Design an enzyme around this catalytic site. Sequence first.
Site, mmCIF file in Angstrom:
data_model
loop_
_atom_site.group_PDB
_atom_site.id
_atom_site.type_symbol
_atom_site.label_atom_id
_atom_site.label_comp_id
_atom_site.label_asym_id
_atom_site.label_seq_id
_atom_site.Cartn_x
_atom_site.Cartn_y
_atom_site.Cartn_z
ATOM 1 N N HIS C 90 0.913 -1.189 0.000
ATOM 2 C CA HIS C 90 0.000 0.000 0.000
ATOM 3 C C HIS C 90 0.910 1.186 0.000
ATOM 4 C CE1 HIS C 90 -3.603 -2.270 0.969
ATOM 5 N NE2 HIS C 90 -2.863 -2.963 1.825
ATOM 6 N N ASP C 93 -1.084 8.885 -1.048
ATOM 7 C CA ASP C 93 -1.001 10.051 -1.914
ATOM 8 C C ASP C 93 -1.812 11.122 -1.215
ATOM 9 O OD1 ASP C 93 -1.925 12.016 -3.856
ATOM 10 O OD2 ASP C 93 -2.229 10.515 -5.395
ATOM 11 N N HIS C 95 -3.457 14.625 -1.634
ATOM 12 C CA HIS C 95 -3.682 15.669 -2.635
ATOM 13 C C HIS C 95 -3.205 17.029 -2.076
ATOM 14 C CE1 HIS C 95 -7.255 13.640 -4.954
ATOM 15 N NE2 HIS C 95 -6.150 12.897 -4.974
ATOM 16 N N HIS C 130 -5.365 9.250 -0.330
ATOM 17 C CA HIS C 130 -5.810 7.875 -0.671
ATOM 18 C C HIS C 130 -4.608 7.055 -1.011
ATOM 19 C CE1 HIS C 130 -5.384 8.493 -5.112
ATOM 20 N NE2 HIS C 130 -5.888 9.714 -4.900
ATOM 21 N N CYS C 131 -4.786 5.758 -0.908
ATOM 22 C CA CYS C 131 -3.833 4.809 -1.418
ATOM 23 C C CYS C 131 -3.823 4.830 -2.963
ATOM 24 C CB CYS C 131 -4.175 3.421 -0.875
ATOM 25 S SG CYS C 131 -3.050 2.122 -1.356
ATOM 26 N N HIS C 140 -7.762 -0.085 -4.652
ATOM 27 C CA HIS C 140 -7.532 0.218 -3.255
ATOM 28 C C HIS C 140 -8.506 1.306 -2.817
ATOM 29 C CE1 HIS C 140 -3.552 -1.980 -2.264
ATOM 30 N NE2 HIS C 140 -3.988 -2.411 -3.448
ATOM 31 N N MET C 145 -9.778 2.789 0.957
ATOM 32 C CA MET C 145 -8.427 3.231 1.451
ATOM 33 C C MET C 145 -8.267 4.731 1.057
ATOM 34 S SD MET C 145 -5.068 0.995 1.568
ATOM 35 C CE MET C 145 -3.738 1.595 2.596
ATOM 36 N N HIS C 250 -26.543 17.579 0.995
ATOM 37 C CA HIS C 250 -27.653 18.457 1.282
ATOM 38 C C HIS C 250 -28.042 18.149 2.736
ATOM 39 C CE1 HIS C 250 -31.479 20.545 0.601
ATOM 40 N NE2 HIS C 250 -32.025 19.624 1.368
ATOM 41 N N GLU C 274 -28.376 25.275 -1.027
ATOM 42 C CA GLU C 274 -29.293 24.199 -0.704
ATOM 43 C C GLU C 274 -28.565 22.851 -0.848
ATOM 44 O OE1 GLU C 274 -31.612 24.971 -4.860
ATOM 45 O OE2 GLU C 274 -32.753 23.543 -3.622
ATOM 46 N N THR C 275 -27.923 22.671 -1.975
ATOM 47 C CA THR C 275 -27.222 21.456 -2.281
ATOM 48 C C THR C 275 -25.930 21.880 -2.921
ATOM 49 O OG1 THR C 275 -29.295 20.323 -2.655
ATOM 50 C CG2 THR C 275 -27.361 19.312 -3.501
ATOM 51 N N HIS C 301 -27.790 14.159 -2.475
ATOM 52 C CA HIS C 301 -29.130 14.407 -3.076
ATOM 53 C C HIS C 301 -29.358 13.863 -4.474
ATOM 54 C CE1 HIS C 301 -33.057 16.355 -3.371
ATOM 55 N NE2 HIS C 301 -32.925 16.912 -2.176
HETATM 56 O O1 LIG Z 1 -4.041 11.749 -6.723
HETATM 57 N N1 LIG Z 1 -4.409 10.807 -7.774
HETATM 58 O O2 LIG Z 1 -5.357 10.040 -7.688
HETATM 59 O O1 LIG Z 2 -34.610 17.706 0.887
HETATM 60 N N1 LIG Z 2 -34.355 16.289 0.875
HETATM 61 O O2 LIG Z 2 -34.293 15.608 -0.113
HETATM 62 CU CU LIG Z 3 -3.739 0.279 -0.460
HETATM 63 CU CU LIG Z 4 -5.978 11.320 -6.166
HETATM 64 CU CU LIG Z 5 -34.405 17.544 -1.025
#
Ligand SMILES: O=N[O-]
Ligand SMILES: O=N[O-]
Ligand SMILES: [Cu+2]
Ligand SMILES: [Cu+2]
Ligand SMILES: [Cu+2]
Lengths: 334, 341, 334
Positions: C90, C93, C95, C130-131, C140, C145, C250, C274-275, C301
């Site tokens: 494993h 990474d 970001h 993440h891996c 992974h 992961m 949401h 809202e979302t 949502h």
């Molecule tokens: O950061 N690359 O998946």
């Molecule tokens: O506002 N809920 O889906």
């Molecule tokens: Cu891994």
């Molecule tokens: Cu990435």
């Molecule tokens: Cu909604």
Amino acid sequence: AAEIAALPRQKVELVDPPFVHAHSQVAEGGPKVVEFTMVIEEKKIVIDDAGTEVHAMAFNGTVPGPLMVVHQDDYLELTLINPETNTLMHNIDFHAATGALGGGGLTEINPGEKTILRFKATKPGVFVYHCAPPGMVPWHVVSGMNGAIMVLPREGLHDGKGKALTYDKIYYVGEQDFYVPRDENGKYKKYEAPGDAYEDTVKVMRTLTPTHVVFNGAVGALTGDKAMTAAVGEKVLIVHSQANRDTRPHLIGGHGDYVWATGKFNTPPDVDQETWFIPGGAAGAAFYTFQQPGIYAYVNHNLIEAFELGAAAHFKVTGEWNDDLMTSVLAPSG
Amino acid sequence: ATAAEIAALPRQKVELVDPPFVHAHSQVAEGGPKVVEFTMVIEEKKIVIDDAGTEVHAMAFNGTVPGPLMVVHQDDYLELTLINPETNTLMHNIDFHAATGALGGGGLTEINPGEKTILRFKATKPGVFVYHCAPPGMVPWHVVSGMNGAIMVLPREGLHDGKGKALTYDKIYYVGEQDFYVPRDENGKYKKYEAPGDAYEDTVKVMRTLTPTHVVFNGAVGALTGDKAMTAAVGEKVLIVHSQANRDTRPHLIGGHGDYVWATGKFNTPPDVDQETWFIPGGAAGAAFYTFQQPGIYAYVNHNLIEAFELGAAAHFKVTGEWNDDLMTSVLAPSGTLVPR
Amino acid sequence: AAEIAALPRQKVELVDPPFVHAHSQVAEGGPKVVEFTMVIEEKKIVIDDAGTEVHAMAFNGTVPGPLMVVHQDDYLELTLINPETNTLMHNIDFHAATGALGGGGLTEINPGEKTILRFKATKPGVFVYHCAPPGMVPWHVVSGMNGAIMVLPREGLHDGKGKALTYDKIYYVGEQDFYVPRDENGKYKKYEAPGDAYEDTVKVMRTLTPTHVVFNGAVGALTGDKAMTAAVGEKVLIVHSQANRDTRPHLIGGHGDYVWATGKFNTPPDVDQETWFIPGGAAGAAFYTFQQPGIYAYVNHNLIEAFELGAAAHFKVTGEWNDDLMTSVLAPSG
Ligand SMILES: O=N[O-]
Ligand SMILES: O=N[O-]
Ligand SMILES: [Cu+2]
Ligand SMILES: [Cu+2]
Ligand SMILES: [Cu+2]
Ligand SMILES: O=N[O-]
Ligand SMILES: [Cu+2]
Ligand SMILES: [Cu+2]
Ligand SMILES: [Cu+2]
């Protein structure tokens, strides 16, 4: 909260999308209790030219439900009615509202009941509303039970830098993903009652792949002669909602001059957009001034969704051609 | 301008170059509005998209997927001669998302095999914008057969950050990302066809699933990897323009960032900053500016990592220079004991 | 050089999501080397109420891995350990980091090995980690992961117009797409070792359709007695990550008052959302002040992913109801 009894009341007559009820952009006067009534209808709709049916669950009898317009800090007071001719419990969740699952926890109504909900519209923007009954949330939403409200700022719309934006025309495009079951032979199935389609529909929903994606309830609803109209030089607000699934609207031949892609008017608009993105669960609005006449198509720009699955509308715009903006120098020729 | 004033303007003819490179241009415009001329020939041709030899009948502007990037400045006029040779079988046209009216030009450019057309439009809005073919009745099929590209309309005064500071790039690359929908036979092996028309029905069936079989940069799995990697040096400022005419994508530079990103692709909307992964919706182009601070290999991917590493949407950058241990260092290299497993 | 060598060092003990290790919003003192240790566990987890199990590959034994908090221009120094009980190589990474594929190129450890990576946290925001082992990256990541880190500005959070935003509570919701193969009968498969599931899992992954989309590693992990809590008047920051696939969070009954939907605190936040939308491969954060008590649901949502596939959480909020914001004028009745 002292007192709302004292505030002016105003009753609004709703109209069917894509039109919007009368309203003023700038608020005439103080805070109001703005009153709406909607009746829920469960009914079969036909969604394409092959006779495909959905059991729609429709606010005001339309998919989408109608646009409601209030101003910031108005109270929106809704009378919601579930007639005895319906078969299911329904409710309403306003994303514009604060508390009790957007009003969902206060509005569960069985066939033969009504309810009245009041909420304060504290945040300006366009917002989705939808039905959300416990345990059957997505099935009501993807059976067309959703619409949008707009909460305008008191001073009306402004660009990012305080300049006023006044529209001539406003249109409301509700986009709907539908999941229609098919038999062994690849034909869409028909049913005799909403509850009969339930299990088969949930199977299609779990694939996450709609069989149709439509504007205003059917393929070709807003095309040809049912086309939205404008004129060269008119300023148009296009409100677009999708209660379940992402969309990426594009006006073919035009732009979004100002786009509140998030739908929220205190967030400054993006400018000069080719294609904007509205996540499932939100509404967005784009402002454009038409510069050329002719037919425009308004589409979700996943072009498979637009042209194969149904997500395409027309604008028919009148005026004189501007050869400076665009011209055929040499027409197609051998 | 009137037609009289337009005919008076200086004309500049540009020779296009294949992606991911971009033809010579100036960032800041020298002079006033010009009429910039481009020519493209449309080619329907079989392309091989993976190492397994999977074919598609591509419909390619200028013979590449994506079609080439055209660069003009705001309020220039872009004049395109578009040619559809008598050896093609289908009607084609072009829709510029940068253009205003007639379905972005599509309604004025319908050309059958043996025809040509010349379109001119004024580039009134600065940004990067998709162009694509769009023939009535067959719109997604041409676009998902590779018939799309992008143009960049630079501000007269070149690019600036949100606070009006100038941002001058040293290199530009154009990554066009393409979703393909290749039909499979009974055995799950990709089908082969004689002519584009023969693939139509079977391709529409795959398209309606909304699930592509391949998502690639520059027309093929691995097209921008190995010896075809993009290159830069530590300290170099690079603009990466990325387009997707049909489907969303979420680019990410593995080991880097997007220091300024116009995720919507439009230069009057201020750029987002310090982005890890940005989002370009289907039907748009976006641009990201980055200054390389570390040498080595980087991968540039769509960060649905199944689309990147199973379906093909991964490119490399090879960056020259000295390593910076202040930014990152291996304090203890992998070590321990060799154990049974 | 000497400088770097003399910085203070702080060892932080990690806590499992959705909770976050103690930290200060405003940095106390100048830059430091913040030390964390994580052990990787490959283990079988149960992800739904039908006993579906997947071989998870988990940083610190949890899905998602824990949230690490530093401030801008601190160094994060991670000791990463791959115990001899595991089967696969494993790495990690970040970001947030610059160079060597986010650290992935420097941290490839077989079982029985450990490594220590230091990087400078130069950009403020929340970021995925993440891996990513060469040639098996997605497998992974969609085995769990992944996690996130938060790099706070030195001056704590601000609304970009310069006003301080101070949260009372922070929660970390990691959303995971899982791709669990089924046999001929439609029942989810079980496997002896993770390598045994590989070929079948990649076939499901290629459909781009997850079988489950969950928060905190299982359907219902953050509902009922495990709901996140707050009180009326508290300010809550919700950090949400998705390492592979888009999501659209949401808060049902609420909003995102300030949302850094891109997760990067030098980009000013969207407001009144809202979302919001977090693309796959990113983390976002939303800041909200609760105004009403009661149950809130927090969902992706796309409501099919929320209520059919598992992407729904609860908040339970205590305090007094505010009738001005919302009131049932007439309760459901005939
Ligand atoms: O950061 N690359 O998946
Ligand atoms: O506002 N809920 O889906
Ligand atoms: Cu891994
Ligand atoms: Cu990435
Ligand atoms: Cu909604
Ligand atoms: O520009 N419409 O595809
Ligand atoms: Cu309902
Ligand atoms: Cu074509
Ligand atoms: Cu287009």
